[PDB]
Write a protein that binds this DNA or RNA. Sequence first.
RNA 1: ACACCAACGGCGAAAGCACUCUGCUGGGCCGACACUGACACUGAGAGACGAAAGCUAGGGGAGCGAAUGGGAUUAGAUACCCCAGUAGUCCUAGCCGUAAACGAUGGAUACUAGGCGCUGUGCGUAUCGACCCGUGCAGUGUUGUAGCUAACGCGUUAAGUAUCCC
Lengths: 111, 44, 118, 84, 62, 247, 64
Amino acid sequence: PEPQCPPGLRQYETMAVLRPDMTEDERLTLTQKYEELLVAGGAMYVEVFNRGVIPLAYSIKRKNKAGETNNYLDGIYLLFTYFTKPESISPLEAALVTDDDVIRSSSFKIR
Amino acid sequence: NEERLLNRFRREVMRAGVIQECKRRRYFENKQEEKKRKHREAAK
Amino acid sequence: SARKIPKGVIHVQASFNNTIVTVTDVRGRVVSWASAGTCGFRGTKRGTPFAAQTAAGNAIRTVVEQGMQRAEVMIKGPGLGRDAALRAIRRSGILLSFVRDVTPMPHNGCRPPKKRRV
Amino acid sequence: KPRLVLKFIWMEKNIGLALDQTIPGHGTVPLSPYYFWPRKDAWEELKVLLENKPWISQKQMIILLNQATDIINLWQQSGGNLAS
Amino acid sequence: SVEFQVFCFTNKIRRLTLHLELHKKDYSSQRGLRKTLGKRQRLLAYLLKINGVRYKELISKL
Amino acid sequence: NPRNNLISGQRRCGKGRNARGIITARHRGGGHKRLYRKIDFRRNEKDIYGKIVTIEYDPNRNAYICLIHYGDGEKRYILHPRGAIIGDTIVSGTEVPIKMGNALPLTDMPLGTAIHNIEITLGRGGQLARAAGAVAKLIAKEGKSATLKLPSGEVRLISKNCSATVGQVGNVGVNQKRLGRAGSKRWLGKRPVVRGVVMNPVDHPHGGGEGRAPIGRKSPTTPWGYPALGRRSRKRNKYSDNFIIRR
Amino acid sequence: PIQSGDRIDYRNMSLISRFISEQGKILSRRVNRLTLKQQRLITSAIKQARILSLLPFLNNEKQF
RNA sequence: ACACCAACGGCGAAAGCACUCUGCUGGGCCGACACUGACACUGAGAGACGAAAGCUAGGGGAGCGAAUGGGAUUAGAUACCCCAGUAGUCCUAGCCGUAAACGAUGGAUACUAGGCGCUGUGCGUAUCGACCCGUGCAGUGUUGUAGCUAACGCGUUAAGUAUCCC
């Protein structure tokens, strides 16, 4: 079902880990910035599914906007099996670095 | 306790010989082929 | 005195020419340290397994005001001072939970200096 | 996947640890490797051989390593004393 | 098909050149641009060796 | 469009140097009239956009300035940063996103950003880091202060509610614009300075005798007697707001 | 063996962690007994999962 | 700067290239006839790139570290050892154009035993799916027939047999 659209442009999958605290505006507001990606990308944007929060190995260094406070052991594991033009992925990187509830966001390009 | 030593025995898994390796200088393929040829043949 | 808790970590800085046997609590305030230079002899003699045995013995013989049962040892580094130190702590025989290594394993950080050519 | 035997021998000076290993889903012939009288490492040599196999499951490698460890341990104590 | 080779190499040099001039330091693709120029140039000396008028059309097309 | 009716006209005459008439800021005089440019340091119109139409050469500065309009009917000049595309839009405000050219108070922004025009307290026009390439960075913030590394290799915790125009200020290439015409120093209204060895003992403390005189005193001094090497000229108790001099 | 049809990704933490040790370091091809292609692909995937802190860079030493 | 991965491994024309991810982009290999029809090889002079050290300009500077300074060994020590340590090392933009820049082997085509390997793809077997066997090629390695060689050795990636070009 996914090989329908990739005549024309590319395919990706972004892994992004989250804060473990909030349960509200986490599925919501990060899907709203996924709608910011929808203004950017506008392709078969499906399967943005969530993975359960588990203890990771080692993480420090949240870098809140002038917080620089929280160490972590847990995080919500979002991954977006999205699909876009190869133009404007670096603004997705800046969007997934600058926002607070998204730390350590590594995108990929499955083949 | 008994006088058995499994820390030395377990220590050769990842030997402290990566620290007698890293005291002296970063040198290129002549002594990395000597140490890593003798080491690629010590495990075979 | 101290917090008076009989569990606490022991660190053994086994150097290439020395040993240091320090002992500290869970937070990290040292309750005693004794090295090979502490226990008398100094020079080419220090950093040998007799110095590890004597330095460990004179290190943890002074924790009898605590009388620590639950011991755990966190050694570090290369040298001839490890195995005699563990035989010293097992000679004192207190409840050694687990020994471990915390040695700095670099990921090619800094250039180590010149080879000796001696 | 067949299952396994370490054989130890204690004589005062010298341990031998001998690892006899077995087949995965791929038909293989191990020996028993005997690790030797000089101070050259027995556990590292044995465990490394097992890891190099992958043909050995974790349970199998570990059970043999635990038995090996136990003998090296008894050997160290007997050598430091005279048990015999 | 020859004029698809010359025209295809011409679009190759267009897209690779507008890559390279806004980039300016890739010293690996410089060989690709120069192999394309030389390969196309031996094609143009080939079709000039064969014909007049037809190679005049290849010049006048681009 | 020259004669903007924002060049503001009347000044104190040229590069002056007279307090009561005595030379008190030395080596000044000469050059053009150098009519100043009243620019808009403290942006008093927040949350209204404004384009950029002209990069005019201010002779008072080391950098350039730029003429900015608004959606309403006004005209101002501001320091344009590096990367001022002609026709680009700048807008001051409290929640305006970070762009090379606009202004915002020092709270609502991240840390580790290039900013030229910052304020040292509220209400002032604009003090620090406004030269031709003077760029100030942010180390992390605090309860009512903000440690700011300004372009001297010097850090300073500052009042957090201060306006700041984010961007690296342009015209950096005056680091290398050579004055090799050798009388172009006089075009800037800067007379030649005489040297202390070749003066008389009534004028400078290093007034010498025969030949190229060595400096003679235990320390090289100013023409008013104070030692001119290493002696920090700073009052011992003013603010204690700086963290480390780092110089 | 254990190729299992589906390709090795960082999301597949079953065959991954059969390949690292408990000390957390990558084992070679002659130990893991794969092809060169399997080895490089689990290498890049394991280092990706190393970025996501799914896997430790160092495991603290233990006895008893 | 990037441990284990690291392999007698992959890529590049060479120098070189390894923490991961993205973008642009070179080059290689394989198949079907799908197309053109010798468009081929080499290359004087020329042009590009070209480890490291070096130099101009500006940053940056933790470790290491010429020069230097002190301590030691020494008859002596400007040296090996040790403690500090500046240029340099890194980056931006250039210049320099040399190295044991080594496979001590210019390039290209055709032909001439094998064994043991590795890498990439292709076919058939086997299952119907990962294997696994043979293979078609290209590349990389190790022993080796013939032949060559003063000998050591090289040997389908020749230092063999021939042809061309510098």
